Design a protein around this ligand. Structure first.
Ligand SMILES: O[C@@H]1[C@@H](O)[C@H](O[C@@H]2CO[C@@H](O)[C@H](O)[C@H]2O)OC[C@H]1O
Length: 392
């Protein structure tokens, strides 16, 4: 695995691209998304500052809301790209405005998943893959830059947040939406991330939230009393992808049950299909395989998913039944980008075509560029051999 060797595959170099052109492609994507035209290209906004220095956020330009996921992805992108100033400004806004510090609030220890640009929460409850990326990005920051003090003691922040994600108690109290009850972010017996800590829907998961590549980091550097739990979560997630991904297409549903079956949310029953969340599952298991080499099923799964998408050439949808029926939409940059990341584990040389398709793309513009753009820039970093485990 790359962590053992320190050698991360440069999949773009493997399909013949020069290092100068790979650097240009990543820098163009960063400059567009972080510093491009505010109305058409950028998803990052400089939002003044406070006692900790500059504030900034990554946001969904469509709804015009800040998302905890996009903040956490901005932190991961910026630490992988050695962009400390941008990292610190995003983290300052997330910790200042999104993090719930009241111990009587049911979201204590968690980041509001959806927040207006003025800091008014739409929902105090979290999207738990945001927390997973925040903690990991903070550990990576500690490793690359060393720890600062206060909110910039990245390792201390990560330890405290991650401990509370596991050990949170049930809290009932007032929220922006009325009285709510929430629990921990990982089920203590299943050792799986929840879709939500809201007690009304807590005993569910989401395959795209399963991040065994990161749980292995936490198994090494988290508070000692939790390391066995995070190690377990990594093994459970590898088993989860084996059960949750269709046996023929390797498509996963957006939302799921702990036993691997798809879950139809009452408010979103189409969550049983492969949609916007599920795009990411293949990145998660392929990254885990490339880093750690433990998910013995990952190569075949990535091969099945790329074989399936090869049947869709010239008629690509972005919504599918798990058995591979197209359910609508055309090609998206986010799905192209995630499919390319399957090459971190695929064995069949059709993966070349998927990495080449990502290489051919341009940075996204217009109303849907937030999800397309964060996935694009993460996929470019993975495929350039520039998305690494920075272990403190
Ligand atoms: O109260 C809970 C809501 O907070 C939860 O909202 C979800 C949070 O993650 C987002 O990615 C989803 O889009 C959003 O629906 O839904 C479940 C409910 O119990």
């Amino acid at each position: 695995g790359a962590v053992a060797t320190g050698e991360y595959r440069n999949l773009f170099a493997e399909i013949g691209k020069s290092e100068i052109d790979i650097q240009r492609k990543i820098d163009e994507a960063f400059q567009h998304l972080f510093y491009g035209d505010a109305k058409d290209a950028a998803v990052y906004y400089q939002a003044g500052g406070n006692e900790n220095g500059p504030l900034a956020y990554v946001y969904d330009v469509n709804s015009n809301d800040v998302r905890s996921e996009g903040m956490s992805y901005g932190m991961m992108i910026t630490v992988q790209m050695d962009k400390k100033a941008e990292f610190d400004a995003i983290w300052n806004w997330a910790k200042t405005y999104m993090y719930q510090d009241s111990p009587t609030h049911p979201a204590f220890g968690y980041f509001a998943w959806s927040m207006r640009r003025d800091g008014v929460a739409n929902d105090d409850m979290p999207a738990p893959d945001g927390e997973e990326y925040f903690v990991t990005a903070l550990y990576f920051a500690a490793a690359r830059w060393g720890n600062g003090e206060g909110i910039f003691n990245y390792q201390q922040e990560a330890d405290t947040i991650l401990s509370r994600m596991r050990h949170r108690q049930v809290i009932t109290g007032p929220t922006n939406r009325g009285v709510m009850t929430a629990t921990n972010l990982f089920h203590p017996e299943e050792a799986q991330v929840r879709f939500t800590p809201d007690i009304n829907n807590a005993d569910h998961t989401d395959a795209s939230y399963h991040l065994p590549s990161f749980y292995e980091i936490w198994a090494r550097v988290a508070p000692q009393e939790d390391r066995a739990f995070w190690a377990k979560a990594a093994d459970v997630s590898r088993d989860y992808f084996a059960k949750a991904a269709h046996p023929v297409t390797a498509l996963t549903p957006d939302y799921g049950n702990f036993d691997g079956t798809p879950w139809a949310a009452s408010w979103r029953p189409e969550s049983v299909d492969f949609r916007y969340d599920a795009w990411r599952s293949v990145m998660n298991w392929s990254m885990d395989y490339a880093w750690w080499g433990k998910d013995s099923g990952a190569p075949a799964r990535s091969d099945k998913l790329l074989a399936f998408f090869e049947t869709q050439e010239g008629k690509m949808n972005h919504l599918y039944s798990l058995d591979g029926k197209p359910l609508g939409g055309g090609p998206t940059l986010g799905l192209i980008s995630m499919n390319a990341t399957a090459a971190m584990a695929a064995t069949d040389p059709r993966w070349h075509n998927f990495v080449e398709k990502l290489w051919q793309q341009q940075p996204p513009t217009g109303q849907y560029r937030y999800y397309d753009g964060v996935l694009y820039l993460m996929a470019l970093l993975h495929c350039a051999g520039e998305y690494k485990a920075w272990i403190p």
